[PDB]
Amino acid sequence: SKQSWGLENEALIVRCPRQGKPSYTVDWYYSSIPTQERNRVFASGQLLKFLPAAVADSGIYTCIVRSPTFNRTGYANVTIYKKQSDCNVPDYLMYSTVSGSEKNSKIYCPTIDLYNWTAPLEWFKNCQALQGSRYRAHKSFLVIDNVMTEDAGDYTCKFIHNENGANYSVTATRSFTVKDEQGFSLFPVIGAPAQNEIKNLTCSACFGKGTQFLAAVLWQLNGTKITDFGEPRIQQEEGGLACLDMVLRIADVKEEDLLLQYDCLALNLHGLRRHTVR
Amino acid sequence: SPITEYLASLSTYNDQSITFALEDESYEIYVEDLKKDEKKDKVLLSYYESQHPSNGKMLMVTLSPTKDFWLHANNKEHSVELHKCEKPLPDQAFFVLHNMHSNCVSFECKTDPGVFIGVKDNHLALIKVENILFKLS
């Protein structure tokens, strides 16, 4: 059961929520639907098509996929709108997308996969057709190399879905956000310790320049986190440099503490680095 | 025995979100553009250490979409499936991580080489070898 939307005069294809194959066989219903070409609204396989969509067409359109070792069934909540000459696409179309300055350039045109398009498409930032050097559009996306914090805005792409040779107009809009700093990262590096003996202990490792999706330094004990007397116990901290640290704590030494490894670890998406103390 | 476990959003090269849906008996997995401010399905990546090297040893991971379910990789059928299995997790639940540019990752089957979770016809499937494209959040 998945929602879908679009304007009047525009083509809209809608995929059936429960998935399956060609030769698995799908049916659609409104409020028993044309399988090919009742000339405006009809359904080909998993794809409910509206050519073009009108507001009257809003409703729930249920669908059923049949194996027949099963009949899976799933619905499409659907709404079609009147363009308001606001010139500003209202907050309901698609979803926000970020980028670096020159550091990431790419805005994808939503839902385009659903449609049949052999052409180069048009982009518009807040009712202003893009052009020139800085904006260069290719395939299904838009590449902006110029990007400042100035390219924040709602980008809308128009393209054409062609059916039997009938051309229809489709558009989609989404917001674009510029990432303040885009930093790098590499395999983690443990400043402290080296492989070494102690006889209050600490581990610091360093993962890159930026702010990491995933960076963690953590203490393992005999290669597990959890074997316990009242101690060991683990504690953290935080400081264009990006590095993390974790401190062990042990108040009272005991004998067991001689045998088995105290393992500092730093991990990343790049992988894991471990050091051993004793 | 995972080393750490964190939630992250999943998304493709072209920025489609990978959503999960559990009809609680069977399921669906979507690769599709969401609506602004619609929250994204977060999945638990649990990170284990492969002896697969790097520079060192690179991680693998298992993804719980939710509440005691994981991503099982179906070999001959080139598919991703969802399983319950309280039991200690099997080899098709595991994926060697790979990292090229930032956050941009691909998942290779611990069991059978050169086969990655990837995307085909707007569905999630397995690929034998740019269509293995995942961002995290």
Ligand SMILES: *[C@@H]1O[C@H](CO)[C@@H](O)[C@H](O)[C@H]1NC(C)=O
């Ligand atoms: C759906 O499949 C069932 C059982 O597999 C089949 O017998 C039936 O014809 C289908 N649904 C209906 C009521 O048409």
Ligand SMILES: *[C@@H]1O[C@H](CO)[C@@H](O)[C@H](O)[C@H]1NC(C)=O
């Ligand atoms: C898709 O577009 C091609 C060329 O634009 C056209 O020839 C074809 O009929 C279309 N496919 C269908 C059947 O929708």
Ligand SMILES: *[C@@H]1O[C@H](CO)[C@@H](O)[C@H](O)[C@H]1NC(C)=O
């Ligand atoms: C759109 O459809 C019309 C009708 O046949 C066709 O003549 C035209 O070339 C199509 N536009 C393009 C350039 O794809």
